Amino acid sequence: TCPFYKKIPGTGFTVDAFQYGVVEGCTAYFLTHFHSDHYAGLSKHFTFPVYCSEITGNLLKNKLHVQEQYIHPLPLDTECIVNGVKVVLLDANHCPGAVMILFYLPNGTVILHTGDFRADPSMERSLLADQKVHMLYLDTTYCSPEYTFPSQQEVIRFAINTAFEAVTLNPHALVVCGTYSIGKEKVFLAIADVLGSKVGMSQEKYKTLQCLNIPEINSLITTDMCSSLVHLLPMMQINFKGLQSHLKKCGGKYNQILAFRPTGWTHSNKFTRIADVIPQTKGNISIYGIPYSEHSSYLEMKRFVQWLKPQKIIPTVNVGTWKSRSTMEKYFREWKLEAGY
Numbered sequence: 001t002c003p004f005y006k007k008i009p010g011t012g013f014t015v016d017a018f019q020y021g022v023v024e025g026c027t028a029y030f031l032t033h034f035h036s037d038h039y040a041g042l043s044k045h046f047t048f049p050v051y052c053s054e055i056t057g058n059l060l061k062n063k064l065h066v067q068e069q070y071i072h073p074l075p076l077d078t079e080c081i082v083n084g085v086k087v088v089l090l091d092a093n094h095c096p097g098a099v100m101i102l103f104y105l106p107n108g109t110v111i112l113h114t115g116d117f118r119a120d121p122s123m124e125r126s127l128l129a130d131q132k133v134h135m136l137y138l139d140t141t142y143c144s145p146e147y148t149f150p151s152q153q154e155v156i157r158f159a160i161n162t163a164f165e166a167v168t169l170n171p172h173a174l175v176v177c178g179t180y181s182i183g184k185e186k187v188f189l190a191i192a193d194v195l196g197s198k199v200g201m202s203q204e205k206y207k208t209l210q211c212l213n214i215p216e217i218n219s220l221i222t223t224d225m226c227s228s229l230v231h232l233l234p235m236m237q238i239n240f241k242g243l244q245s246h247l248k249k250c251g252g253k254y255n256q257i258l259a260f261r262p263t264g265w266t267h268s269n270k271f272t273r274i275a276d277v278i279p280q281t282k283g284n285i286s287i288y289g290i291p292y293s294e295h296s297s298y299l300e301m302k303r304f305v306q307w308l309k310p311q312k313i314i315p316t317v318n319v320g321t322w323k324s325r326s327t328m329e330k331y332f333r334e335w336k337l338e339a340g341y
């Protein structure tokens with residue numbers, strides 16, 4: 001049964017609620033982004049109206065085969081009317097196609113659902129600036145002060161510099177990047193751009209990237225692995241056994257692998273700076289864990305909320321334990337007392 005924190009009161013709407021069968025009273029189903037924990041349940045047999053971004057709509061049609069007549073894509077930053085309720089989709093700074101959703105209830109209440117997001121000061125100048133928000137449904141993934149990580153830009157600087165140095169020392173090294181979902185495309189695209197290579201990948205993954213409206217993509221990716229020196233593999237194969245095996249398959253073209261695992265947070269963050277990150281090495285294989293996040297750090301989250309000043313916060317992540325819930329509620333109170341709302 002659908003939990004309360006996926007329901008929008010005073011509407012017929014749910015958010016990211018496709019795994020519960022027919023939700024009683026739901027007249028439209030919103031989907032914030034194409035990640036499996038959120039889309040779980042959608043297929044070609046779905047016959048209710050789904051409302052989402054253009055990019056999420058492309059993925060629904062091509063990857064899950066949802067029928068076109070049930071896909072309702074909306075433009076960003078534009079006031080739209082859905083079943084008699086004004087809504088606006090905003091960029092969530094998460095994966096491609098990811099949105100937050102502003103709902104303007106018929107009684108005057110205004111709700112923001114963040115979906116999954118990485119808060120940024122740029123959001124303080126969207127259509128959020130223009131009215132008060134009463135209730136916030138918040139991505140609380142890293143809602144604890146131990147979660148610090150660098151900017152995306154510092155992480156890509158590290159990755160480009162490391163790859164360029166390694167391949168310039170050894171023109172026979174191959175770079176491998178792990179993936180298991182959309183998101184974090186800048187990692188492998190930035191490395192390929194510095195090396196003057198296209199990214200090589202499976203046909204399934206190529207199909208997925210072709211749905212993303214990324215400019216000049218035919219220029220950056222390919223299914224011809226033999227022509228590429230940056231290869232994308234499943235995240236599960238990013239280990240010494242999986243990489244040894246892949247290196248065999250390249251037929252003696254390469255004699256070394258440098259690999260990247262973009263994680264979110266890992267406790268090496270508490271102590272070590274990005275500049276100081278070192279790989280795990282075995283023989284001619286090195287594996288770098290890099291803290292590339294698509295969710296808010298604790299500080300980014302706190303800045304957003306203290307700027308928005310919502311009357312009520314509803315967490316959407318870490319809600320399954322009493323200790324987690326109590327911890328987040330204590331931070332929300334601190335923030336409110338410090339800022340004065």
Ligand code: NI
Pocket residue numbers: 033035094116
């Ligand atoms: Ni997500």
